Amino acid sequence: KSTYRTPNFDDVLKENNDADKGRSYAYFMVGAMGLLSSAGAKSTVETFISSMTATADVLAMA
Amino acid sequence: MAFRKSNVYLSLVNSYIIDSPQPSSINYWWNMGSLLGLCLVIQIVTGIFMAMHYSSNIELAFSSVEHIMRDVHNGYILRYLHANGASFFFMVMFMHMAKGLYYGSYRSPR
Amino acid sequence: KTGLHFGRLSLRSLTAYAPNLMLWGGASMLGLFVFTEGWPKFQD
Amino acid sequence: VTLWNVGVIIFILTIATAFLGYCCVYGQMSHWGATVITNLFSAIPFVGNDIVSWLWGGFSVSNPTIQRFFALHYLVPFIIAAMVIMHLMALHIHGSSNPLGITGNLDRIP
Amino acid sequence: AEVTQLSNGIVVATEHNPSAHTASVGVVFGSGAANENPYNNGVSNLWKNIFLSKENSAVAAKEGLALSSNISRDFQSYIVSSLPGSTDKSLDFLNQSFIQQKANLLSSSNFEATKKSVLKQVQDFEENDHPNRVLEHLHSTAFQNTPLSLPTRGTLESLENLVVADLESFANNHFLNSNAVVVGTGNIKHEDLVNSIESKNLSLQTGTKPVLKKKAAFLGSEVRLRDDTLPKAWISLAVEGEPVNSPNYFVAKLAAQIFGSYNAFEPASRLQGIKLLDNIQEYQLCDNFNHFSLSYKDSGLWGFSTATRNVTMIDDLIHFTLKQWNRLTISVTDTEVERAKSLLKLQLGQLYESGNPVNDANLLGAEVLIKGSKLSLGEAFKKIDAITVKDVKAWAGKRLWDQDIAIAGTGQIEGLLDYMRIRSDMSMMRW
Amino acid sequence: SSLYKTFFKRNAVFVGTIFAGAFVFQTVFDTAITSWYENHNKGKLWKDVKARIA
Amino acid sequence: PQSFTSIARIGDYILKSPVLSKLCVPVANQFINLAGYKKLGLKFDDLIAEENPIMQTALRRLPEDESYARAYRIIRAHQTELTHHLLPRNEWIKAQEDVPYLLPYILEAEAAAKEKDELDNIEVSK
Amino acid sequence: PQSFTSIARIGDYILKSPVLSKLCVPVANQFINLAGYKKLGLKFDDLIAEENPIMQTALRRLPEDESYARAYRIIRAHQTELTHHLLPRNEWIKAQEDVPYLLPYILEAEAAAKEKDELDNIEVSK
């Protein structure tokens, strides 16, 4: 068979292509994954840092 | 060439986690070695922050672990992540070794 | 009439890349101030 | 230049290591030397009194200050050992200089 | 350029030049390789070689006439050349092989000798001409399952099934009066061409070309033809460009002139004012490149081709080129636009003012079929002079920034990475 | 859909809009969970027992 | 890294002035004799640091018989230093042999690099 | 790593015995059909591990048209596995196509390596 004949990709291609359909739907999911990861990495750093503050028995003698 | 290939320190990062050629057909059993590096980071970080409140004398050792659980802010989170993180470190290591038994990873040239 | 290179800068790099280097201080700035909140630093 | 910049980082970490171990003796020079240095950070505007209370674990140099200074003293010598390896990697790509200041590629010995 | 429709419906176009020593008369049709299906692909390449066969060329050579033919994706041409004063002899030859007598060229002895000659040319093209067969594979993967993906020469598998009844069926649907333009260039004036055509009354039936069902569409895809016994690697890469009759037709041509052409073995091509040459000459990443802007009736292609022997640094050549395309959206300067204005006026001044009347007859006839007239060279120069830096940034933000690409390659192309690491270089992550 | 074309218009979000929306997320998420948790356990908390001795 | 174009610009202004030449040139003669590189058998152009693209260009364009002589003077100076001695006095570089053999190759490689910078950062003047 | 000379020595003794061939060969036929490599479009000689100098010698001496066909069967099997499917049933390797194409190159590279060991550790017999 000729190499100029491309095989069948019809079962995975879109209805019509319409470039802002797979673009808008993928940029929302990457943006939502980066928003939840920055909020979770912020709560993790502040959890370890607040362990080095004064304990409950130290500020009871204040 | 690119700066990630010519710099002395960035070339080690590029050659290991960016441009490293991988076989196309490896499955999810090949993801256990990456989890073991995350387990070792969790154990070192949670243990250093707990070691600022620990006393190792024979009459002070048990009561300083109770002091971490009650008085230190988020100290129960530090201990439970450390005690349960050691059991998760051994479960992933058993699965990592059994993958090498099944797929013949011990053989030459490895 | 020729421009300026400063070594390896350009003044017409600073046409758009210096507002952007300040957009590296308009965006990516908040990781200095949101990464604080949890221990309060309320001031501008 | 990269070999010179990594050596400046090594020098700062060595000054910090010798300060932390000197406070672990808790002599009369250890208490008042830690008091002078930690009170310097209360002059930073708007975050002066929050850094110094987080560095003490309390209201002065006390029991939480010494217990956290010893745990940090165990760790920073292992960070110095990792920066020494990065120091030798930058030396390897260009080699050493010589007391004449000119090229050495004409006459080498192992 | 003068265009005139006659009483029986023939369109005549003429570009007179009194300082030429030859004249060319021909017929241009408005159907090319994009008007076929995958079964008869190659009937236009067979009609060209029937016109240029030995028994046809021997009749023309006794009168002092030369023959030419050209097959493209949108048009075909059949041109006769002579001396200025033998122009009615070249009209009688063109009459007796397209209108009055065509069954003597399609004899069985002449057809089988021609068919085995074309089968030898396509087989030699597929094994030896590597920069040109990579650009043909780029058309077949970017416009796949659409009429604009068929190769202009045909394929080796489709040409062996063609018989003499396929050529008569294609001529009856496409060689019509409403699809044709009669052209004339060189030392020939418009009124003697019109009066010579009107002297032969020419019935010329009133058919109409068949209309296509599918419209041409772009698809982001790739095709790899790996061959480790070849010494180089040949790569082409493109995005979707502008058609003919686009308002951004000249803006896309000026953007390709900014990056231009290159030859590593010519000393003066290494001194050009192109910022891409600073990156690729340090480690000698390639042998040559060139940037194009192809335009058709429905769609177009904008990109570059390259060839290299540095097969272990292919990923640096693609990365440095696509990072320079990013600068057209954000940081293109004023000196680069003024340099590309002067080099574009020199480039298409040498295309439209060569001394070959066969080249001028192809460019004139192909333009009257689409627009009905020809744009002058003086009016094209005023459109180029009115392009600003804001026009370039507005075009590139629509056509180049974060868009789908089509790739084709052959040879030692193991160092060419996946689709998704080349696709992610179409934006910068900075902005 | 098209409501993820009105706000952004074919681009990614940006690195600064990720950090800006992450801090707005933290104060709304913390308030909505503390309200659901204390309503699910109503009558058992100390602020409910303290009222019933007065 | 000042420039060799800037060194020659200041130095030519001193040598053309009649009152600045009588005051600065005897100071420069004692500065060179106290440096002591001629006692190791070296010229001054052997001392210039070479790990830069301007200096690598000028060393390629040097004629072959002068590159062989330069390589011998550098090797002889490395052997003299590790023994902690000086050369014999009949092998010292004289004052009329300490010529700038490498300076004309440096000045033409620097003028070409400056011209490439002014053409790559040029503004149109329509 | 047993040897391919030892595998053929035991296997030829079984196939020449009339009572051992009726008992062991139907067991070997069900062992191959339960292995399932023919459903991925592979032959058995594609499965042999190749990072040893005996196997690198035998792959150099293979004719060129068989090396091109072997490289396609390996690439097609890697793509079939990552999609977690099998091939269509008309593309399975049949039983009369699973021939040992690589075994005669292996057996002659091993006999030459054994002869080099007996000559390099030989004793004189004066």
Ligand SMILES: CCCCCCCCCCC(=O)OC[C@H](COP(=O)(O)OC[C@H](O)COP(=O)(O)OC[C@@H](COC(=O)CC)OC(=O)CCC)OC(=O)CCCCCCCC
């Ligand atoms: C201590 C806790 C550690 C937690 C992390 C460890 C998790 C890893 C578990 C061990 C493992 O790697 O086994 C994986 C293996 C499947 O490997 P495979 O590549 O052949 O299948 C690819 C898949 O079809 C497509 O996978 P696909 O990419 O399409 O979807 C991803 C999938 C998530 O899968 C995983 O994260 C790994 C489990 O998403 C979904 O399932 C959708 C439903 C929400 O599964 C099996 O073969 C048998 C399943 C049970 C094995 C458990 C044995 C543990 C004792």
Ligand SMILES: CCCCCCCCCCCCCCCCCC(=O)OC[C@H](COP(=O)(O)OCCN)OC(=O)CCCCCCCCCCCCC
């Ligand atoms: C010092 C020595 C330490 C040694 C540690 C030994 C104990 C290890 C405990 C974990 C055992 C898990 C086995 C992990 C081995 C992974 C490799 C493997 O078995 O492949 C998966 C197997 C076959 O995979 P295929 O490639 O043939 O095709 C799969 C298509 N589904 O496909 C399957 O059959 C699915 C595998 C399911 C395994 C479930 C059994 C394990 C249950 C363990 C329970 C332990 C807690 C009680």
Ligand code: HEM
């Ligand atoms: C590979 C890394 C490590 C492993 C597997 C590990 C394992 C353990 C285990 C199983 C315990 C007992 C937990 C319990 O039952 O309470 C423990 C306790 C402890 N570990 Fe680690 N550890 C690791 C690293 C570290 C490091 C690096 C430090 C200190 C810098 C540390 C500090 C401590 C301390 C202070 C305790 C005290 C008891 C407690 O707080 O629970 N650990 N460790």
Ligand code: HEM
């Ligand atoms: C624990 C600390 C250090 C270790 C183990 C170390 C080790 C070394 C070694 C083995 C060399 C090889 C050549 C030589 O000995 O000169 C070297 C060279 C060098 N080091 Fe360090 N060093 C340390 C600290 C520093 C510091 C504090 C600086 C500067 C602020 C520095 C800057 C340099 C430089 C510039 C060289 C190159 C010198 C030359 O090649 O002439 N190093 N170092």
Ligand SMILES: COc1c(O)c(C)c(C/C=C(\C)CC/C=C(\C)CC/C=C(\C)CC/C=C(\C)CC/C=C(\C)CCC=C(C)C)c(O)c1OC
């Ligand atoms: C085959 O594919 C892979 C692959 O998939 C992966 C993931 C990797 C990547 C490798 C890993 C994930 C493993 C690497 C893990 C390690 C080397 C673990 C080392 C851990 C550390 C260095 C921990 C260091 C932690 C500290 C120093 C804690 C610091 C704490 C401090 C300073 C507390 C004091 C704080 C204050 C404010 C005083 C590969 O290399 C690779 O091969 C090509």
Ligand SMILES: CCCCCCCCCCCCCCC(=O)OCCCOP(=O)(O)OC[C@@H](O)COP(=O)(O)OCCCOC(C)=O
């Ligand atoms: C466009 C690009 C975007 C890509 C973004 C992707 C980023 C993803 C990052 C996270 C993913 C994995 C997380 C793990 C990680 O980041 O690991 C850090 C590097 C891994 O280890 P390594 O330093 O490469 O190997 C380190 C070792 O393998 C190397 O050994 P060494 O000792 O250093 O050798 C030199 C010896 C020198 O010795 C002496 C004596 O001098």
Ligand SMILES: CCCCCCCCCCCCCCC(=O)O[C@H](COC(=O)CCCCCCCCCCCC)COP(=O)(O)O
């Ligand atoms: C500790 C790990 C948890 C951290 C989770 C962070 C996930 C953040 C994902 C959101 C990113 C949004 C931007 C995506 C993007 O396109 O940017 C990409 C690059 O971003 C990244 O590389 C994401 C890095 C994620 C690190 C994953 C760690 C590997 C696990 C091994 C752990 C071993 C210790 C821009 O480059 P590109 O457009 O060319 O693709």
Ligand SMILES: CCCCCCCCCCCCCCCCCC(=O)O[C@H](COC(=O)CCCCCC)COP(=O)(O)OCCN
């Ligand atoms: C056990 C230790 C294992 C060691 C693993 C090594 C890899 C870990 C490092 C990961 C990369 C992170 C640092 C890369 C940053 C880029 C450095 C750089 O640009 O080099 C320098 C500048 O940085 C410095 O001066 C020293 C920085 C020290 C970094 C301390 C962490 C520039 O070097 P450059 O490529 O420009 O060479 C000169 C050519 N004109």
